[PDB]
């Protein structure tokens, strides 16, 4: 199963939001959006979450971004399977 | 909020993957006291404010300590009969010497060579555990009792100490180890780390038993034979068969 | 103070179950004798239950020993029908009404002692039926009746510590016999044999003859 | 048990227990003496 | 800030001293019952915690422990149902022959000739025929054993003990603080995912490992005694692979996302299983798994102890538009601090849910052999309809209560509540006009049909054979649903329900579900339903909107939510309170639901339920709905007189209890008319004369006998009215549907 096209889709769809989360490209447990939902607020630390990551990428952020990445990758893989591609 | 800076390097000093999993809420009360305190409480279950019932820091610490001791006993009892049957020292077939086939779950396996059936053993075990755990409970509620009432002379060693998790009388600390408080704290940390490893091991043994229908030592041997094929993902097809 | 029913634990009921009554170990978790009048009534009930269960258990044990010895003595759970078959001239309603009436006479004597501790030691009965008191501090009537008729050997007249020791003997043996009769009923229900039969069956075979092997207690093994 | 017995002496508990015992007595009367149309002595 | 568990250690002592003194909870009930009005007010204000304490924390703790007690009562009820299914039921016999054996789970003691109520249901068993559908539910769960029902009854008794212990513990030992109850973000995050989502996932797991193999063997046809027990189906994937071959590969295709290989037991056909007439259990498994995943996704929307998630207050306050001013400003505070507003919202959506349940469960039965038993089907639909209507009326009541008590104008300035309150006259007038228009164009159509039939002019009445009124939108929606598979539902092998169209589903010689055609009579009765619903909405909304104030009475909020009147002045101000609006809306909900269930029973006895004879379908009444349900005389004669012959000729049989209740409920309904039409002063003066008679014989009670208060009289009247009407309909429906079918 390792190295398959669905494996590549899953690792990319789980790893890309994880990278976008740390570098400020994606919403974060410290970086939220306002009322509009497009622009990202500056990093704020009222949650009291700490990490050894220099950019403050918390384990809660890892869990949340990995969860959303798994959801999106599962949707992508199941969509490509049903169309007859993959 | 941003934690408290000076309260964080206490978690960074113990090294490892800690501090990555601690929070500002946890470090409000987790200030280095009690053994095993590595700041890991993301849910805030030991917050002393508004703490009652069993969600209470001393009760939760007591539960952790006796859970980890019971899991150390359970892990050693999981891995001893199978490693003795594999060596052939005991006259038990290694498929029978598996811990969950020892009569704990009769659907999972039965051992009919005990001197009584498991229900009689459970009856006397219920009586004996009722004795032991109820005296333990009343010593927790009153940390000076259980030595004032006669118990065939056994009440002399039931005085305990200030901590319910650490009685350490003439019986509970018969060899008298940890004479000096820092050695006692170090050995307490030893106990809690070994017991939490054993809690993880007991959960793993249960999951492997459901997963592979074989003993944990057999699973370790099969994994060491071919780690690429014999793993969680490689055994994902044949799980209850 | 005294040895409790649950060592340590100082939530023992307020000072109505203090270390004064015989058999007092602070055991009242349901508060069934919290009020003092109910406490005195329940002391009377406990003493009467202990004495009655002691008599009944002694009779059951002796008739079960005689049954295993080959005597023409039925077991306790079937003695009524055996008596009616051996004695067909006795009407069941006759014997039941006679038992009701004779038991009622002495039970109304005891009842009017409960209402008034000093009212039964006069009239037709002599002064020996006045009673000696004991519970709740009174010195008259109650479950403990002195005199030369209910204490004809006089083992609680003289030496008060002897009286206390014998009272503790009586209350402990009475509670033990109440639990013994409960066990007799449960063993008859779960096995269908007598108490001595169960005892010698378990002594002959310690294993495979416990309560889990009768099919009634554990309802599948 | 003074307060518990006072609760048992309260009007709803007493009326429910009283109608229960009266109904049970009448039911067992009809169980042992059924179809009593008249008071035939 | 920071969601966490906060409790108080030992707030209330556990003893019986307040059991001795009734009325302790409220100060107004102190100093003894001087009158019998005290006795009535003691029960009237038992659950009104706002009048007991002013603290929101104590109110919240009381509500939490009352919820635990209610859960214990429900668990006792479930334990009783499972115990009666175990001991006094013919469930095993019914499992062998579900088509012919009538379900029964209650027997009676032969005492006064009442053993005639033990019916000849079948299976060598005598008992009351039940209409609750527990047998179908247990067969769907895959019981097929007496011992398992008893084990479930014991487990439910244990759960009831746990519920009661939890309530005592959370009122007396560890009572949560006010800010614990106000963590609505955490409560929603746990109810969406941990309650509903995890419950759906767990039921999908049970259905996979228990319901599918046992019901598959039952559908293939096997006596339930030799069916393997649920655990050994769950124990190894071998037998499962024999029944569903995708279990040979285990969980490997799940984690590799090759989920299409699970299509043997995770299916999507639609329609009904032809063996049983219920839904496909694999489809139910797929449904429960999908909604469990959806609900667990929904359980991560709100922000708790970590930065991810959105706050409810932030989402509310940002939904403001030009037409509405400040929008949802203040809704978060009046829902996290007022229990009555949450009760109103939850009761409304709960009653709507119950009504939706009734609809979706007649339209397409989810349990095996539920369609063929018309008795349990009609009973379940009618019961859920009545529960939904009651809960909706209670929603109106508690919205009115919130408007009276917990509505503060300071924090509700120019928001949606304020905007609605500032133009209440427009809304109420317009709903009044809609109600009048619907009443005319629904009831007057029936009256015109009556007049033309009675004048000998059948060509002039509104009917399918004369002046047509066809539900073209509804018929086209049925066509869209019927044509959905293979077009707009490519993965569906059949439509959701046979009601849209297609072939007749017949199970055991009886129709499970067949297409329903809509004509003129259906048009008329749907407009009648709309009219009745609109009038009930009008009364409840008028009470809620004018609870605070009015043109006639500007200070109605001072008089409270529940007061009788404000005197005979201003022409007369009788029943001005919002309570009396609930009192009238109760009657109107009764009328609405009664017409709905009458239409349901007649429509499916005339066009759905019936027997098959390999050349057609013989309905129960014979298609008489299409030519008689447009006339009130048709409803009175062909439905209300023709179907009433089963309940009035039921004496001397097992339905004699239904016959007796049919008259007793008439008695109760007409007994209501005493309280509804009369007034307190007459009864007070008559009671004065009776008190004179008692004084003459020294038998005067110290507790002074008073006539029932005006609100007391209205409540007693409406309670008796609804009880009598609903019980009359219940006895009629059950006797008719158990005597013929
Ligand atoms: C970009 C790659 C990709 C591709 C090629 C596909 C392709 C496909 N997806 Mg998919 N999907 C993707 C990404 C992709 N998806 C992602 C990133 C997600 C989020 C994780 C999803 C989540 C998703 C879901 C939830 C579903 C699909 C489904 C489908 C299939 C049918 C779509 C359809 O017509 O729905 C139907 C079109 C409609 C107009 C129906 C909508 C009517 C709704 C029910 C009304 C309800 C109203 C309510 C308030 C909202 C199709 C082969 C469906 C499926 O399961 O396959 C069979 C389906 O249910 N996808
Ligand atoms: C269903 C409603 C409900 C709710 C909302 C609560 C809420 C609460 N309870 Mg409580 N409780 C309940 C029911 C409920 N309880 C019942 C029915 C019982 C009787 C068994 C108890 C007995 C109880 C005790 C003794 C205590 C609480 C306590 C508490 C408080 C902290 C508990 C916590 O979050 O820590 C974490 C909770 C846990 C670690 C328990 C999780 C595991 C348990 C055994 C439940 C597992 C059942 C699970 C859903 C089944 C799934 C299937 C499974 C077999 C695989 C909290 C406010 C504590 C308190 O005093 O307040 C501070 C406390 O000591 N509860
Ligand atoms: C490796 C796990 C481990 C560790 C490091 C500790 C450490 C400690 N325990 Mg603990 N305990 C454990 C497991 C452990 N325990 C288990 C599994 C149980 C359940 C049975 C208990 C139950 C327990 C109780 C009830 C008490 C302690 C106490 C203590 C403290 C007293 C000092 C001491 O004697 O140390 C222990 C030394 C070692 C663990 C190293 C020796 C290891 C050898 C190989 C095992 C010895 C077993 C021996 C062969 C059997 C015969 C013993 C003897 C007659 C020869 C100390 C910090 C007491 C206390 O708190 O004092 C205040 C006390 O009250 N423990
Ligand atoms: C019916 C016999 C009986 C009665 C009337 C009493 C009465 C009394 N006992 Mg006693 N006791 C008994 C039997 C009895 N006991 C037995 C058999 C034992 C040995 C297990 C004991 C051991 C005992 C101890 C150690 C102590 C007492 C004490 C007391 C006193 C205070 C407790 C109280 O007020 O509760 C009132 C009791 C009752 C109202 C009777 C309870 C009956 C319940 C309602 C029925 C359920 C219990 C039953 C076993 C369940 C199975 C029944 C069925 C399913 C088979 C009181 C005067 C305390 C004391 O201070 O001594 C003076 C104390 O220390 N008892
Ligand atoms: C995954 C966590 C979880 C779960 C499963 C539940 C489940 C439930 N909650 Mg709860 N709640 C939770 C978290 C949770 N809650 C949290 C975090 C909070 C704080 C914000 C609350 C605050 C809260 C309030 C204020 C109330 C509830 C209520 C309820 C019950 C809804 C009514 C009903 O009849 O449902 C269906 C019935 C059932 C499903 C029967 C199963 C019951 C078992 C025992 C559920 C066990 C779950 C429990 C949380 C485990 C921990 C307790 C443990 C110590 C035993 C329901 C059982 C209401 C209620 O009825 O009070 C009791 C209510 O008043 N909850
Ligand atoms: C989740 C459901 C729910 C809850 C929690 C509440 C809670 C509350 N309601 Mg409410 N209500 C509800 C649903 C609910 N209601 C529904 C569905 C309706 C429509 C019928 C109403 C209509 C309503 C009104 C009109 C009023 C309340 C009031 C109240 C408050 C005081 C209740 C009280 O103590 O009076 C006493 C409760 C009783 C005396 C219980 C008996 C009620 C009848 C007689 C029982 C019906 C008989 C039953 C079917 C058995 C028949 C068989 C028989 C032959 C034996 C309280 C906070 C009152 C209030 O002032 O609000 C502040 C108020 O007057 N409610
Ligand atoms: C079916 C309808 C109905 C019924 C039964 C009654 C009955 C009664 N009316 Mg009435 N009335 C009605 C309609 C009705 N009315 C209407 C529509 C109006 C116009 C508003 C009036 C106006 C009216 C007036 C002005 C007066 C009466 C009076 C009376 C009482 C006359 C005394 C009597 O005959 O004793 C017969 C008793 C009964 C019929 C009650 C039935 C017996 C019960 C059911 C037995 C209890 C069993 C059980 C415990 C029930 C509770 C169940 C529950 C606990 C679950 C009587 C109770 C007069 C009065 O008060 O008398 C002094 C009075 O002055 N009525
Ligand atoms: C089960 C579902 C989720 C459970 C969540 C709830 C449980 C909470 C437990 C969270 C951790 C607590 C704190 C940990 C903090 C922590 O980790 O402590 C650090 C730990 C040991 O630390 P010590 O206590 O020894 O610290 C002392 C030293 O640091 C002195 O400097 O080192 C490790 O990292 C061991 C773990 C390695 C694990 C190796 C397993 C590799 C398998 C990888 C599997 C994933 C990929 C599979 C692909 C096939
Ligand atoms: C049947 C229950 C009837 C119990 C009799 C009345 C209890 C009175 C009492 O115990 O005193 C209150 C007593 C306080 O003493 P007080 O000064 O008399 O109020 O409360 C207690 O300490 C014990 C309360 C236990 C009540 C048991 C309730 C039923 C438990 C069933 C578990 C399942
Ligand atoms: C920390 C924290 C904090 C935050 O905040 C939150 C959270 C996340 C929640 C957390 C976490 C937690 C956790 C992880 C838990 C887990 C635990 C465990 C696993 C336990 C076990 C535990 C375990 C245990 C005791 C066990 C024990 C065992 C035993 C006895 C055994 C026994 C036996 C043996 C010998 C063998 C034979 O043949 C049989 C038997 C008889 C069977
Ligand atoms: C660069 C760097 C690094 C790296 C790191 C990493 C790479 C990490 C990671 C990690 C990971 C890689 C993670 C993952 C994740 C994910 C998760 C944790 C999730 C989840 C969950 C969920 C939510 C699911 C769901 C579901 C189910 C349940 C089934 C069906 C399907 C679905 C999807 C629905 C280090 C530090 C070494 C060094 C330095 C720097």
Tab-separated table of C-alpha atoms in Angstrom, chain A residues 3-66:
chain	number	residue	atom	x	y	z
A	3	UNK	CA	3.820	4.662	-2.122
A	4	UNK	CA	0.416	4.338	-3.797
A	5	UNK	CA	-1.368	7.308	-5.348
A	6	UNK	CA	-3.914	7.427	-2.516
A	7	UNK	CA	-1.041	7.263	-0.009
A	8	UNK	CA	0.572	10.251	-1.739
A	9	UNK	CA	-2.735	12.149	-1.701
A	10	UNK	CA	-3.216	11.430	2.015
A	11	UNK	CA	0.314	12.441	3.025
A	12	UNK	CA	0.126	15.622	0.930
A	13	UNK	CA	-3.361	16.560	2.172
A	14	UNK	CA	-2.269	16.000	5.778
A	15	UNK	CA	1.174	17.652	5.506
A	16	UNK	CA	0.268	20.765	3.480
A	17	UNK	CA	-2.243	22.250	5.995
A	18	UNK	CA	0.268	21.405	8.729
A	19	UNK	CA	2.901	23.500	6.938
A	20	UNK	CA	0.402	26.273	6.171
A	21	UNK	CA	-0.675	26.301	9.819
A	22	UNK	CA	2.768	27.080	11.229
A	23	UNK	CA	3.843	29.717	8.691
A	24	UNK	CA	0.697	31.804	9.285
A	25	UNK	CA	-0.923	30.717	6.017
A	26	UNK	CA	-3.723	28.864	7.856
A	27	UNK	CA	-5.751	29.633	11.006
A	28	UNK	CA	-4.088	28.635	14.248
A	29	UNK	CA	-4.950	28.161	17.924
A	30	UNK	CA	-3.128	31.501	18.343
A	31	UNK	CA	-4.007	33.105	14.971
A	32	UNK	CA	-7.729	33.477	14.259
A	33	UNK	CA	-9.869	35.327	11.740
A	34	UNK	CA	-12.202	38.213	12.497
A	35	UNK	CA	-15.829	38.708	11.480
A	36	UNK	CA	-15.095	38.606	7.736
A	37	UNK	CA	-13.162	35.334	7.922
A	38	UNK	CA	-10.635	36.180	5.196
A	39	UNK	CA	-7.943	38.186	6.969
A	40	UNK	CA	-5.956	36.589	9.791
A	41	UNK	CA	-5.494	38.327	13.131
A	42	UNK	CA	-2.002	38.653	14.644
A	43	UNK	CA	-0.897	35.841	16.935
A	44	UNK	CA	-2.456	36.062	20.398
A	45	UNK	CA	-1.665	33.892	23.401
A	46	UNK	CA	-4.620	33.799	25.815
A	47	UNK	CA	-4.989	30.015	25.452
A	48	UNK	CA	-1.772	29.552	27.433
A	49	UNK	CA	-0.374	26.964	25.019
A	50	UNK	CA	3.403	26.524	24.895
A	51	UNK	CA	5.728	24.500	22.692
A	52	UNK	CA	9.384	24.089	21.800
A	53	UNK	CA	8.501	25.105	18.242
A	54	UNK	CA	10.101	28.533	17.607
A	55	UNK	CA	6.959	29.810	15.855
A	56	UNK	CA	4.645	28.546	18.605
A	57	UNK	CA	3.092	25.716	16.580
A	58	UNK	CA	1.231	23.887	19.342
A	59	UNK	CA	0.259	20.221	19.532
A	60	UNK	CA	-3.392	21.304	19.534
A	61	UNK	CA	-2.706	23.002	16.203
A	62	UNK	CA	-1.113	19.766	14.974
A	63	UNK	CA	-4.189	17.769	15.992
A	64	UNK	CA	-6.644	20.270	14.478
A	65	UNK	CA	-4.794	20.740	11.185
A	66	UNK	CA	-4.209	16.996	10.870
